[PDB]
Design a protein around this ligand. Structure first.
Ligand SMILES: Nc1ncnc2c1ncn2[C@@H]1O[C@H](COP(=O)(O)OP(=O)(O)NP(=O)(O)O)[C@@H](O)[C@H]1O
Ligand SMILES: Nc1ncnc2c1ncn2[C@@H]1O[C@H](COP(=O)(O)OP(=O)(O)NP(=O)(O)O)[C@@H](O)[C@H]1O
Ligand SMILES: C[C@@H]1CN(c2ccc(Cl)nn2)CCN1C(=O)Cc1ccc(C2CC2)cc1
Ligand SMILES: C[C@@H]1CN(c2ccc(Cl)nn2)CCN1C(=O)Cc1ccc(C2CC2)cc1
Ligand SMILES: [Mg+2]
Ligand SMILES: [Mg+2]
Lengths: 356, 356
């Protein structure tokens, strides 16, 4: 049986697949054509159907897992297309213990059981996130750091991505930005809590963008936002005060009211779709950073790691988060990021396989 | 000189006016026609021009202030129309010490000084809020409680507005929902801090609503929202899990992703403008309640009072706030509201008049 871990989220399915590379001669005889066909299909394609993608650059090579050497692969596709995945799974010449997490492990349990003799084991979506994150960081990204930060995030001429060491990772605030946001306080390998969450997450960015701009993809939304000026939509401190609000240390450039200039008909008429995309991104990202900061201060944790796919190919939000956390905490908190940010739940699920 | 206090916000100007009612015979001789004309104009009209409104139901009658008996009046108009107000102020037969707060006391300082021999004294917008709130509560609302809560906010068949006693008001978390949000921790009459704020406030509700629905007023936006179903736009916990997320006590009805269903083209095509208005209101209100709760827990304050004009004629948001704070704090925090919620800064400004 192939070794998969699966995180079925509200928006995306993430799949970790361990490809053995130490297959012997007698081991290839004792394996069925369908097992060979699935291994060949997964490793010889980087697009699967019309919406599946293997993130080739994330592959972990020559990993020893469960006493075998192999490569760990990272694949994603829309949860909306899970029926197609399950149909392909029921197809002839494919007849497995599947560790699954995320909400969809429960919602689609009965659908996975249409695959004959498949054994589905549901695991908790935040327990899998924790052990996946700790595992990838422990094995490294092919010898490079899994974790990084933006050095000198206050100065743009200096702000550069730099590796960050998490060899003693506790305590840790994990901010999981998916469709919504979950915020976790990790005190040990076996001691963590969901301290809170927010419903203003990646799905809010994509949903509002689509309504406001007509964009048809996450990437198109980000490309619109990169061209925009959020201050066309947002009311700033200087629009209210005429400059800084000195008494409480609020700089004139801080957003006083997100989309607050859109109360004026003449401004709604002059704002561009790119401006609205950028205002949506800034609004969502700042609120996440602000909630993360309050949780860090309350939990007394100074390391905040942001994960989830809201941040993939999204350097705008990452830099905004890095700069904001540093500025508003007056340097007391650091924003940390992880190369495998969207996949930790899927890896954690795969790690539960020995328990079955 | 008439006794005014003025709070010039990013969206609305609030004006408190003290009308003396113990004017003697010899006092009426020694007063100028312009002073008489302004008193008559203010007390004989409830609409001023096309956008000024006197909130007659809020009037405090037979108040003793600065050793005089009179009535305290509450008037509001859009900051956008302040040029008209200043022009009327420069008009002949109107030729005052004006205590002003809010950002616009600084932004429009030079404009107020076009009124000859007017003396403008700027006061801080949150210091004025505190002393105004404490003062109105101390004098009562014509003998009724200024402060109220929604009893049994978890049960709708029982949930009713009830008076709340703030005779010993400290400590207190004050959540000021204007264009944006400021959150204050009040420990004594002279000891308070702005613990944080959020840029997702009343101007976000009105701005996003106008973009999403075409509504042209705050009241039209609220009326649209009252007819809508936010779950048409929002992705709920049960849309992701199929039911409750038991492990972390998240009910199926909780919003997992605000506007998160709008990532699907077919749902954007079926959602109504009323649904989007309601989703905007729920998103803004829940985020405010959530931020207020984190601040209360961190500050160790169990009384949270919500003020600002986002909540005027807005019982939907008030009940949402009451229910949410009670539910998510498991009954440890109570949402408190104030009858004069939009005007405390203007009253605080007026109270600074003796210092000049
Ligand atoms: N190709 C993509 N398609 C859709 N959303 C994308 C894509 N790439 C990035 N995103 C963003 O990533 C978010 C989904 O992140 P993800 O961590 O996979 O959440 P999820 O697990 O599907 N949801 P959840 O149930 O809340 O944990 C979306 O809301 C988008 O903001
Ligand atoms: N007639 C109205 N016109 C505009 N907004 C209204 C009106 N009635 C209620 N509101 C709401 O009340 C909000 C303004 O509240 P308010 O407390 O007066 O803020 P402000 O002082 O003008 N802004 P700020 O500079 O942040 O303190 C608006 O954003 C709307 O959500
Ligand atoms: C429980 C928290 C805090 N909520 C409030 C609301 C009002 C108040 Cl007064 N307090 N808290 C708002 C919603 N929440 C969330 O976690 C939303 C949420 C749930 C579930 C997910 C992921 C799918 C797992 C992602 C996101
Ligand atoms: C300083 C706070 C917190 N901000 C962040 C952002 C990122 C991070 Cl990481 N942390 N905090 C977001 C903005 N803020 C505000 O107060 C916004 C704000 C300013 C001013 C007003 C009123 C006009 C007085 C109303 C509202
Ligand atoms: Mg997820
Ligand atoms: Mg204000």
């Amino acid at each position: 049986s192939p070794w998969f871990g699966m995180d079925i989220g509200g928006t995306l399915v993430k799949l970790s697949y361990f490809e053995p590379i130490d297959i012997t001669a007698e081991e290839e005889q004792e394996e069925v054509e369908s097992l060979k066909s699935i291994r060949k299909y997964l490793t010889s394609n980087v697009a699967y159907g019309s919406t599946g993608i293997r993130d080739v650059h994330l592959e972990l090579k020559d990993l020893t897992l469960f006493g075998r050497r192999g490569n760990l692969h990272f694949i994603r596709f829309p949860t909306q297309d899970l029926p197609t995945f399950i149909q392909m799974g029921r197809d002839k010449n494919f007849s497995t213990v599947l560790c699954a997490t995320g909400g969809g492990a429960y919602k689609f349990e009965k659908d996975f059981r249409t695959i004959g003799n498949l054994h589905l084991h549901k695991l908790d979506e935040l327990d899998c996130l924790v052990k996946g994150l700790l595992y990838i960081d422990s094995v490294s990204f092919n010898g490079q750091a899994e974790c990084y930060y933006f050095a000198n995030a206050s100065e743009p001429e200096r702000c550069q991505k730099m590796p960050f060491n998490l060899d003693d990772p506790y305590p840790l605030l994990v901010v999981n930005i998916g469709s919504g946001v979950s915020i976790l306080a990790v005190h040990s390998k076996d001691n963590y809590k969901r301290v809170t969450g927010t419903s203003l997450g990646g799905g809010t960015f994509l949903g509002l963008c689509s309504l406001l701009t007509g964009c048809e993809s996450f990437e198109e939304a980000l490309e619109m936002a990169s061209k925009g000026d959020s201050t066309q939509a947002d009311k700033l401190v200087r629009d209210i005060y005429g400059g800084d609000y000195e008494r409480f240390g609020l700089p004139g450039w801080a957003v006083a009211s997100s989309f607050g200039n859109m109360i004026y008909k003449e401004k709604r008429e002059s704002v561009s779709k790119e401006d609205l995309a950028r205002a949506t991104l800034v609004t969502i990202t700042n609120n996440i950073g602000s909630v993360a900061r309050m949780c860090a201060v309350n939990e007394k944790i100074n390391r905040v790691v942001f994960v989830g796919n809201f941040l993939r190919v999204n350097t705008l939000s990452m830099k905004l988060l890095a700069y904001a956390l540093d500025y508003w905490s007056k340097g007391q908190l650091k924003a940390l990021f992880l190369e495998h940010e969207g996949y930790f739940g899927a890896v954690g699920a795969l790690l539960g396989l020995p328990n079955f």
